Structures are given as structure tokens and as C-alpha cells.
Design a protein around this ligand. Structure first.
Ligand code: HEM
Ligand code: HEM
Ligand code: HEM
Ligand code: HEM
Ligand SMILES: *Cc1ccc(-c2ccn[nH]2)o1
Ligand SMILES: *Cc1ccc(-c2ccn[nH]2)o1
Lengths: 141, 146, 141, 146
């Protein structure tokens, strides 16, 4: 559950991502695939080579979904319903993998936005990504 | 006991540039802030009531230095993490009853702190090598649970 | 995130507890203290001997809070704010202990309500207790 | 794992009544229903698309029976769980890459199924003894990760 300060922190920090959406999303994906190679098997037909255009395009999709989640932080089950259909109903992603990607997103943010990545903001971003992960891994229809 | 030779060279090279006086206190502090139930294990450390109080707490910084010393000990003995951490495993598991998921969390907070300090130098391959280090440390600290 | 079916599964199953609230809550706590002795360290001031009057009365408070959670399943952060203040702000309970108690509550329900405890209802009850656990371990004020 | 002699007798007495045709399949089935992502390891088992389909699936029942037999073999070798399960640990860790938290979930699902079948006979002290067993089994399964 996010506090008002959590929501304030997430909106301010994620707002600083801006045009770097696809870049940070693709970097977080690349960090996950390399650090935790078992995550690659959710993408058996992808080109997961370094710098692949497919992973670039996919990181953009992830980042944009997160921007959508940030805009709807009080309405995430409704807002992310189609993404829950995909990840929970069809793909049945193990929630441990959402912890891996969430960590890799925090690593990417810390590496690119050091002034923004304060302990309080780190804490709020972690809770936000945990909340997103719960929505995407739950079958609620 | 299984980093590749290239992963060992990468973790060793980066660790030579790590500020042994700061990074541990920063990692312990963020653990206490990001995962606030961990504060319960540090009742005697004084004011932990706000992020600023945690990160400014002298006892947190001083303890963080000991933490990081033990990580350094692990990095100097990458093929014997179990023996390096055996005594700490007894303390954390038998005596303090810290749930081993908290070891994994502190490991990844340390990775975030490394990322924060080194920025683009903390490349995906450097991170992947460090993920094996902190996983091994957490496994070693949990050994008395195994 | 609970589906409409999750919610009706939980209301039907938990509604069978009835006048057994204190018996079942106390049993779930007893199962927890006996199976996972580390959980006792949150209750050092308690008499935790078996059949302890203090455990029986406490078990009733737990059960009744769950009954209230079931009634407020669509606004649990609001309904459970006082319990979050206790468990997250003051007691700082490690989330693993909520998994232990949730498991022991499922065991108690399976042992007493075998007709209620179908695989789908077991699934909804697990998601319900996990969601309650998240509220009680989150600092959102 | 250390059971008291009183715990061992209670565990053994209950296990001797277990319906070996059904209990294992109900545990594996509930795992697949309550934690649906575990279905990804069983793509060749046919219809897993609904709870009723999962529980009634003959491949689920047959495989659950093997699970139960692995637990039965662990009960008969509590002094050497690591060696009893070394082959299975290689399979589940090196080949299948099952996250060790899932070993713990399945052990607790088994406990729920035992509670479900035996009602009040599954007392808190009986459960406590079984929790030591399933923790011991799950740890042995995870050994090749350690
Ligand atoms: C922050 C958490 C996550 C977010 C916001 C997210 C978001 C998305 C989005 C927007 C898509 C594209 C949907 C579409 O094309 O219509 C997608 C697809 C997908 N995601 Fe995720 N995702 C997350 C976590 C994960 C994780 C942890 C995994 C697995 C390790 C995963 C596996 C997949 C797969 C397999 C696809 C489909 C790729 C394909 O076949 O086209 N997701 N996700
Ligand atoms: C995962 C890597 C960890 C490492 C390398 C580590 C290392 C250490 C070291 C070197 C000490 C000093 C021991 C002594 O001199 O007696 C210590 C103490 C301690 N650790 Fe950790 N630790 C880790 C994780 C954790 C976690 C996750 C927690 C709690 C959530 C924790 C709780 C404690 C406590 C309570 C003490 C005693 C402090 C005191 O009161 O003096 N440790 N640890
Ligand atoms: C999972 C669902 C849980 C629920 C619904 C719940 C509910 C409650 C309730 C209703 C109270 C009494 C509040 C009052 O004073 O009126 C309470 C107190 C307490 N709870 Fe829980 N609780 C849960 C989990 C836990 C866990 C997992 C632990 C620790 C292992 C825990 C430790 C405590 C303690 C130490 C108290 C204070 C007892 C006292 O001194 O009065 N709770 N809880
Ligand atoms: C925790 C206790 C567990 C026990 C005692 C156990 C026991 C067994 C046994 C006896 C086999 C048959 C191996 C053979 O015939 O060579 C097996 C196979 C298998 N296990 Fe488990 N298992 C456990 C946990 C898990 C979990 C949690 C998962 C996944 C979520 C899993 C996934 C599998 C798969 C995919 C197979 C192979 C099935 C096939 O032949 O296609 N195991 N296990
Ligand atoms: C809403 C939410 C997401 C994650 C959490 C949490 C904080 C502490 N434990 N869980 O709360
Ligand atoms: C809403 C919610 C909380 C926990 C869950 C869940 C679904 C499957 N496993 N956990 O859903």
C-alpha cells in the first residue's frame, strides 16, 4: 500500500525518466536477462542479443506501461487489466521474476538518476514496483 | 563457489574502487529505510524514525563498516564463501533468527548502492557478476538453515 | 488483487467460522507458535503455554479482525489502518511471519471445514490472507 | 531433521493411513491451482485450464503419487535427507531450475492436504512434526543450489 508521500516520490522520480523511457526499459531488461538468465525462457522466440532492436522496442513497451501505472496509481487493477491478462492468465509468470525485473529497474534508475535516487525515493519506488508486480501476477477476473 | 574467471576479474576490479568507509553504512541504512521491519533487529541503535535519522545515525554507519568488511572478506575468498561466513551464519541464524530473505534483500540493496555510486560504470556484465557474489554471500549466511 | 469470485469464495468460507471465531483463531495461533517457534518472539509478554487464556482471547481478536476484513474486502487499507499502525509502525513484524500465520489459518480451515476448502476456495483464501498481510506490513499513513 | 520419539510415532502413525492413490495428486493439484505459475513446469500434462481439470487430470494424479513416494522415502531416511534426495535435487535445480521457494510452498500444500484429509486428527503438535519434515525435504531438494 502506497502512502501519499510514496505516490509523490514515484511521480516525481519517474517523471524524470521522460524521453529515456525505451532506453531505461531496454537496459533493465538487458540487466535482468544477463544477471538472471533463466528469465530468458519467458521470451523463447525473441532476439535477446545485446543491443537487439526487439529488446529496445520491448523496453519501450515496459517503460510506457509503467508510465501508465504511475498515472493511475490509485486505479492500477483497472488500468493494468490487459497486462494482468497477459502475465498472470497466459504467461503465468512466477512472481520471483517480477522481483528480479523490479530490482533491475531500480539498478537502472540508480545508475542514471543519482540525484533523484534518495533512500526515501528508493523505498517508494520499490513499493510501487511491488504493487505493479502484484497486479500483473494476479488473476482478478 | 562458481564465478567464472571473467566474473572474478570484474568484481575484483570494481571493488578496488569502492569506498569501504561509506558504502556499507549506505547499504545498511537503505535496508532499514526500504525494508522497515529490519529496524526491529537494531533496537539499541537509537533514532531510526525517519530516512534522514537512519542515514545519519552514527551506529548505523559504524555497523555498515563491519558489514562491508565481511563482504570484502567474502570477495577475497570467492571459492570458500561458506567458510568465510560460517561464524556470522551461526550468529544471524541460530542467535538472531534473521529470516534469510533479508540476506537477499541486503545483497540487492548493496547492488543498488554500487549502481548509485558508479553510474554507467556499473554495466550489466559488472552487475551480473556482483549478483553472483551477493547470492553466494546470502546462501553462505543462510548455511546454518541448510 | 481479488477477483469477484475470490471475494465470494472468501465470504462463503469464512462465513462458516461463525461462533468458532475464537476457537479457530486460537488454534491457528497455537499451530503457529508450535510449528514456527521464532514467531513466539513477538509475544514475549504473553503466556504462551498451551490452552493459555491469553492466547484464547487473542485468537478471538484475530478472527474478528479477519471477519471485519472480509466485510471490507474492497477497502482494506482504510478498514485496517489501525492494525497496520500496530503491525507495521509499532511492532515492525517481518512479513515472513504473516506467511506463517496465513498458512496456519489455512490449515485450521482445512481441518475444520473440509467441504468449504476446495482447491479454488483455498486459492482465494490464500490471496485474501496475502492481501491482508500486505496492508498490515505496509506503512501508508 | 530431529523429531522427538513421540513426534516420530505420531508422524508415522498418521502417514500409515495416508491414501497413497489421492493425497499426492491433491497436493500437486492444489499447488498448480493456488500458485498457477507452477503450471509452466508441466506443459506436457494436458488440460490444466481449470481447477477441476487440474485436480482430475490423470497425469497430475500419477505424478503426485511419485511426489508422495518421495516424501515417503524421506520419512524413512530422516537421518540422510541430503543423500536420499541428491538425484532429485540435481533434477529440480540443475535441470528444471525450480525456484526453491516453490519447494517450500509444495511442502506446505501437502500439510494443508493432510489437515484436509485427517480433520481434528491433524493436531497442532502433529502439524509441528510434519513442518519439520517438509522443511527438511524442501532443503534437501534445494541442496544443489547451496
Ligand atoms: C514491471 C513489471 C512488468 C511490466 C510493466 C511489464 C509490461 C509488459 C508489456 C507492456 C508487455 C507488452 C504487452 C503487449 O505487447 O501487448 C509485456 C509483455 C511480456 N512480458 Fe512483461 N512486464 C513486466 C514484468 C515481466 C516479467 C518479470 C516477465 C518475465 C520474466 C515478463 C514477461 C513478458 C512476456 C513473455 C511478454 C510477451 C513477449 C511476447 O511474446 O511478445 N514481464 N510486458
Ligand atoms: C547479507 C549479508 C550480511 C552480512 C555480510 C552481515 C554481516 C554482519 C557482521 C560482520 C556483523 C558483526 C558481527 C559481530 O561482530 O559480532 C553483523 C551483525 C548483525 N547483523 Fe548482519 N550481516 C548481513 C545481513 C544481515 C541482515 C539482513 C540483518 C537483519 C535484517 C542482520 C542483522 C544483524 C544484527 C542484529 C547484528 C548484531 C548487531 C549488534 O547488535 O551488535 N544482518 N552482521
Ligand atoms: C495475518 C493477519 C493478522 C491479523 C488479522 C492480526 C490481527 C491482530 C489484532 C486484531 C490484534 C489486536 C489489536 C488490538 O489491540 O485490538 C493484533 C495484535 C498483535 N499482533 Fe497480530 N495480526 C496478524 C498477523 C500477525 C503476525 C504474523 C504477528 C507476529 C508473528 C503478529 C503479532 C502481533 C502482536 C505482537 C500483537 C500485540 C499483542 C498484544 O500485546 O496485545 N500479528 N493482531
Ligand atoms: C518440494 C518437494 C518436491 C518433491 C518431493 C518432488 C518430487 C518429484 C519426483 C519424485 C519427481 C519424479 C522424478 C523422476 O521420476 O525422475 C519429480 C519430477 C518433477 N518435478 Fe518435482 N518435487 C518437488 C517439488 C517440485 C516443484 C515445486 C516443482 C515445480 C513447481 C517441481 C517440478 C517437477 C517437474 C517438472 C518434474 C518432471 C515431470 C515430468 O516428468 O515431466 N517439483 N518431482
Ligand atoms: C502496497 C505495498 C507494496 C509493497 C508493500 C510492502 C511494504 C512492506 N512490506 N510490503 O506494500
Ligand atoms: C491481490 C493478490 C494478493 C496476492 C495475490 C496472489 C495471487 C497468486 N498468488 N498471490 O493476489
Amino acid at each position: 500500500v502506497l502512502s501519499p508521500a510514496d505516490k509523490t516520490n514515484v511521480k516525481a522520480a519517474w517523471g524524470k525518466v521522460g524521453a529515456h523511457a525505451g532506453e531505461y526499459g531496454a537496459e533493465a531488461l538487458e540487466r535482468m536477462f544477463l544477471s538472471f538468465p533463466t528469465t530468458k525462457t519467458y521470451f523463447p522466440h525473441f532476439d535477446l542479443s545485446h543491443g537487439s532492436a526487439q529488446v529496445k522496442g520491448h523496453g519501450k513497451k515496459v517503460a510506457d506501461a509503467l508510465t501508465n501505472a504511475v498515472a493511475h496509481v490509485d486505479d492500477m487493477p483497472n488500468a493494468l487489466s490487459a497486462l494482468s491478462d497477459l502475465h498472470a492468465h497466459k504467461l503465468r509468470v512466477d512472481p520471483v521474476n517480477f522481483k528480479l525485473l523490479s530490482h533491475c529497474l531500480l539498478v537502472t534508475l540508480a545508475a542514471h538518476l543519482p540525484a533523484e535516487f534518495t533512500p526515501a525515493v528508493h523505498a517508494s519506488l520499490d513499493k510501487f514496483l511491488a504493487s505493479v508486480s502484484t497486479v500483473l501476477t494476479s488473476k482478478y477476473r | 563457489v562458481h564465478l567464472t574467471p571473467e566474473e572474478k576479474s570484474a568484481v575484483t576490479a570494481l571493488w578496488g574502487k569502492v569506498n569501504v568507509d561509506e558504502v556499507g553504512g549506505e547499504a545498511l541504512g537503505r535496508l532499514l529505510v526500504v525494508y522497515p521491519w529490519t529496524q526491529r533487529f537494531f533496537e539499541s541503535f537509537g533514532d531510526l524514525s525517519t530516512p534522514d535519522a537512519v542515514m545519519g545515525n552514527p551506529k548505523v554507519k559504524a555497523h555498515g563498516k563491519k558489514v562491508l568488511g565481511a563482504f570484502s572478506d567474502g570477495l577475497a575468498h570467492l571459492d570458500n564463501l561458506k567458510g568465510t561466513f560460517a561464524t556470522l551464519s551461526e550468529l544471524h541464524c541460530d542467535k538472531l533468527h534473521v529470516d534469510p530473505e533479508n540476506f537477499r534483500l541486503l545483497g540487492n540493496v548493496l547492488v543498488c548502492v554500487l549502481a548509485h555510486h558508479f553510474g554507467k560504470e556499473f554495466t550489466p556484465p559488472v552487475q551480473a557478476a556482483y549478483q553472483k557474489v551477493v547470492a553466494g554471500v546470502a546462501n553462505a549466511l543462510a548455511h546454518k538453515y541448510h
